[PDB]
Amino acid sequence: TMADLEDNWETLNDNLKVIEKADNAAQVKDALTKMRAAALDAQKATPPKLEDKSPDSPEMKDFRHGFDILVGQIDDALKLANEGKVKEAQAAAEQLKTTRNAYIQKYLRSASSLALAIAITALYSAVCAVGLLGNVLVMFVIVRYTKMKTATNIYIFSLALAGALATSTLPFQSADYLMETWPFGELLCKAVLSIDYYSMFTSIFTLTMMCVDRYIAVCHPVKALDFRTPAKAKLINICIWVLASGVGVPIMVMAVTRPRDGAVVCMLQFPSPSWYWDTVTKICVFLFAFVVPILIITVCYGLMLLRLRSVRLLSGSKEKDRSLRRITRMVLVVVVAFVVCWAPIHIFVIVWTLVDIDRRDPLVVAALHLCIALGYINSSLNPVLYAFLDKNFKRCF
Amino acid sequence: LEDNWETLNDNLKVAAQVKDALTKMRAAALDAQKKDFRHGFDILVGQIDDALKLAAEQLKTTRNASLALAIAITALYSAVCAVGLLGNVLVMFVIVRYTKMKTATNIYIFSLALAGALATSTLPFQSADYLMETWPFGELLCKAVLSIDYYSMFTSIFTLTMMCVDRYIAVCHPVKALDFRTPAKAKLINICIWVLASGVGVPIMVMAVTRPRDGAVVCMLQFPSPSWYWDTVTKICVFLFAFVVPILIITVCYGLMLLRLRSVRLLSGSKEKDRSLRRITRMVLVVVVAFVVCWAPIHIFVIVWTLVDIDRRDPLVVAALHLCIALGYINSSLNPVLYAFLDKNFKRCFRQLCR
Ligand SMILES: CCN(CC)C(=O)c1ccc([C@H](c2cccc(O)c2)N2C[C@@H](C)N(Cc3ccccc3)C[C@@H]2C)cc1
Numbered sequence A: 001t002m003a004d005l006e007d008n009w010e011t012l013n014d015n016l017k018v019i020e021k022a023d024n025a026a027q028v029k030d031a032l033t034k035m036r037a038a039a040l041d042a043q044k045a046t047p048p049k050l051e052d053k054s055p056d057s058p059e060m061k062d063f064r065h066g067f068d069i070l071v072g073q074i075d076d077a078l079k080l081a082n083e084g085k086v087k088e089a090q091a092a093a094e095q096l097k098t099t100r101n102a103y104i105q106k107y108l109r110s111a112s113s114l115a116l117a118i119a120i121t122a123l124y125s126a127v128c129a130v131g132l133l134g135n136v137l138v139m140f141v142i143v144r145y146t147k148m149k150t151a152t153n154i155y156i157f158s159l160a161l162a163g164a165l166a167t168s169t170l171p172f173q174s175a176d177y178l179m180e181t182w183p184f185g186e187l188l189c190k191a192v193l194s195i196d197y198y199s200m201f202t203s204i205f206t207l208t209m210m211c212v213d214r215y216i217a218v219c220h221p222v223k224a225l226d227f228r229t230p231a232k233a234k235l236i237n238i239c240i241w242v243l244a245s246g247v248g249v250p251i252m253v254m255a256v257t258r259p260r261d262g263a264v265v266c267m268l269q270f271p272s273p274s275w276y277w278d279t280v281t282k283i284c285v286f287l288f289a290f291v292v293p294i295l296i297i298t299v300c301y302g303l304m305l306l307r308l309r310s311v312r313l314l315s316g317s318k319e320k321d322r323s324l325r326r327i328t329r330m331v332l333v334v335v336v337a338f339v340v341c342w343a344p345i346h347i348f349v350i351v352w353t354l355v356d357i358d359r360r361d362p363l364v365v366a367a368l369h370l371c372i373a374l375g376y377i378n379s380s381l382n383p384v385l386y387a388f389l390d391k392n393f394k395r396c397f
Numbered sequence B: 001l002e003d004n005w006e007t008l009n010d011n012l013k014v015a016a017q018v019k020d021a022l023t024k025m026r027a028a029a030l031d032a033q034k035k036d037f038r039h040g041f042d043i044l045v046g047q048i049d050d051a052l053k054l055a056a057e058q059l060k061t062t063r064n065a066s067l068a069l070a071i072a073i074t075a076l077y078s079a080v081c082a083v084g085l086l087g088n089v090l091v092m093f094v095i096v097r098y099t100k101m102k103t104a105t106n107i108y109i110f111s112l113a114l115a116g117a118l119a120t121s122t123l124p125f126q127s128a129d130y131l132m133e134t135w136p137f138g139e140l141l142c143k144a145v146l147s148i149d150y151y152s153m154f155t156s157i158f159t160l161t162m163m164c165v166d167r168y169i170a171v172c173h174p175v176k177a178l179d180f181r182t183p184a185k186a187k188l189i190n191i192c193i194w195v196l197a198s199g200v201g202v203p204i205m206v207m208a209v210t211r212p213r214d215g216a217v218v219c220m221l222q223f224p225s226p227s228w229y230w231d232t233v234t235k236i237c238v239f240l241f242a243f244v245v246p247i248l249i250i251t252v253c254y255g256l257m258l259l260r261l262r263s264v265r266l267l268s269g270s271k272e273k274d275r276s277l278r279r280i281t282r283m284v285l286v287v288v289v290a291f292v293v294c295w296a297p298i299h300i301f302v303i304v305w306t307l308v309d310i311d312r313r314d315p316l317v318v319a320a321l322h323l324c325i326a327l328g329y330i331n332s333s334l335n336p337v338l339y340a341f342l343d344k345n346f347k348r349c350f351r352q353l354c355r
C-alpha cells in the first residue's frame, strides 16, 4: 500500500536525524539497522507519481536503483558503527542525506497538510460557537422571558437542550483530531462518547415529534386543542430523554480508552465478536436515527398536503388555507435539511465499514470532517432557526 | 405586520384575476403602513393604483426599496476568533516552552502573535454588538475594547513591517546583519513598537465613549470640535501610516532583496545556501500580497462610508462590511509568517506524501 511506503519513508528520515542525536555506537548502529530495513521495503513499493508506470519501466527501475545506492551506503556506515567509530559513521550519514535527494526525492514529494487542519478547526469552532451559544441563548429566553406555557416552547427547549449537549463535545473531538491522541481519559471518554450518541437520538426524535405535533396542529385543529397541552408536551419530551438512555447507557458502558501504537484511543469495546455488534449498532443507528425519522416526517408532510387539498377542494377560506400552507412548506424544509445533513455521514459510516478507503488521504479527511460537521449543523441550527423565526419567541427578544 | 407582508408577496405572484390580486395587495399595504417605512407603502399603493387602471414589476422593486446572514457573520467571527486566539496563544507558548526566543525572528513572531491574540480577544464583544445592535458592556469596556482594537492594529502592522525590514538586512546586508539582528536589539525594536503605538492607544482610549444614539447604546469615538475634521484627519492618518506606509516599506524591501538575489545568483555561484535566501524573498511577496488583499477592502470601505451615503441597513452592504472587517482580523491573527512558523515547528505532523 501507499501507507506502508509513507510509513517506511518516514522511519528512514526519522532514523536519519537519530544518527545526529546519537552520542555512542549503540544508538548509531540501531538507527542504521532500522534505516536499512525501511529502504529495502520502500524499494519494493510504488511511488504515487509512478502508480501508473510498469513495475519494469525505466522510472520504476531508477526508483529502486536509488535505494540500492542508499542500502550500500548504510552497509558502509554500519561497519564503522561495528568498529566503534562514531566520527566516521556519523559523517557517512551526510552521504546518505544527499543520496535520498539525488535519486529517490524525484518520486517521493510531500506537502504540508496544515492548511487543512486549520480549515477543519475553523469549521468545528464556528459550528461549536454558533450551536452551543445559540442553543443556550434559546434555552435561557425560554426560561427567563417566554416561560414555556405553550407545547412548542417545550419542544424547542428539548431540541435546544439536545443541540447544546451535541456541540459541547466538539472541543474534545476537535482536540483529538489535532493531537491524534485522547488526553482527557476514560471518565471524559465515557462522558463524551455517551453524550454524542444520546444527544443524537434525543435531537432527532424531538425534531420528529415536533413534526407530528405540527401535523396534529394543522390537520386536526379541533382535536389539537386537547392534545397540544403543555403538560402533554412535557410527558412526550420526558419519554424521549428517558427512552434514548437505551443508547446512552450502552455506549457509556462500552466507551473505553485503550493504547494503539503508543497513542491513546477513545473507542467502543463491543462484546465478542466486536465486528458483528459493531455492524448491528451501525445497521440500527441507520434505521432508527435516519430511516424511521424520515418516514414519519414525510408521512406527516404527505397527510398535511393531502388534508390541505381537502380544505382547498371545498374552496372556503383563502387566508386560513394559505397560512397553514406555510407550515406544510416548512415541514418539507425540515425533511430536505435533515436528509442533506445526515445522508453524507450515514453513507460514510456504511462505505467505511465495507470499502477500505485510505484514512490518511487529505481529500478523504476533508470530506469526512465536512460530513461530521453537517450532522452537528442540523441538530444545533434546527432549534436556533425555529426559535428566531417563531413570532412569539421573536417578541421576548 | 408579518401576515400583511406575506399577503403582499402572495398575491404578487398571482384581467379578472389581475384586478382581484391588486385590490387585495392595496388593502394589505394600507394595513401594513398602519417615516421612511410608512413612505414606502405610499409609493407601493400609488403604483398599485396605476397597475389597477391597466407594469407588474415596478411593485416588486419598490417593496425591496436577515437571520441567515446574522448566522453566517457569527460563524465567520467565531471561526476567526477561535483560529486566531487559540492559534496565536499556541505560537506564543511554543516560543516560550520550546524555541526559547534565542533568535531575533522568534522575538518578532512573539510580538506579532501577542498583537494577534489581543486583536481577536475583542471579537466576542464586537460580535455581540452586531447581534443585539446595542453596547451593553458599558463605557469602561467600551474604552478597553476600542483602544485594544486600534492599538493591536498598529502594533501588529508595525511588528510585521519591521520583521520585513529585519529580513531585508539579513539578506541584503549579511556582514552588517551580524551586529544588528541581535536578540537584545530585536527586543528593543519590539518594545519601541508597543511603546510607540500607545500614541494611538491612549488617544482612542481617551475619546472612546458610550452614548445613546437611535434609542439604543453606541460605543464610539468623541472627536474634539470640529468632530467631522478630526474624524477625517484620523481616517487619512490610519490609511496612510497603517496601509500606504507599511506597504511601501515591505515592497521596497522586496524590490531591493530581489536585486541582491540577482547578484548572488552569479557572483556567489553554485550553492544551497543561495536558494535559501530566495525562499525569504518569496516569503516577503506572500506577506505584502496577503497584507493588501486583507487590508485594502476595509480601508476602501471606511473611505466610501465617509463620502457615499450607503444604506447601513441593506443586507448586501452588511455582508460586504463584516467580510471586510473579518479579512483585516484574518491578516493579523492568521498571518502568513504565523502560518510558516507553525509549518516549520510542526512539520513532521502535517507533512504527508502527495497521494
Ligand atoms: C473512522 C471515521 N468515522 C467513520 C465514518 C468516524 O469517525 C465516525 C464515527 C462515529 C460517527 C457517528 C455516527 C454517525 C452515523 C452513523 C453511525 O453509526 C455513527 N456520529 C458521531 C458524530 C458525527 N455525531 C454528531 C452529532 C450530531 C447531532 C447530534 C449529536 C451528535 C453523530 C454520531 C454519533 C460518525 C463518524
Ligand SMILES: CCN(CC)C(=O)c1ccc([C@H](c2cccc(O)c2)N2C[C@@H](C)N(Cc3ccccc3)C[C@@H]2C)cc1
Pocket (backbone or CB within 6 Å): B119, B149, B150, B152, B153, B154, B156, B234, B235, B238, B239, B298, B299, B301, B302, B305, B321, B325, B326, B328, B329, B332
Ligand atoms: C460604520 C461602519 N464602519 C465603517 C466602514 C465600521 O464599522 C468600521 C469602524 C472602524 C474600523 C477600523 C478601521 C479600519 C480601517 C480604517 C479606519 O479608519 C478604521 N478597524 C476596526 C477593526 C476592523 N479593526 C480590526 C483589527 C485587525 C487587526 C488587528 C487589530 C484590529 C481594525 C480597525 C481599528 C473599520 C470599520
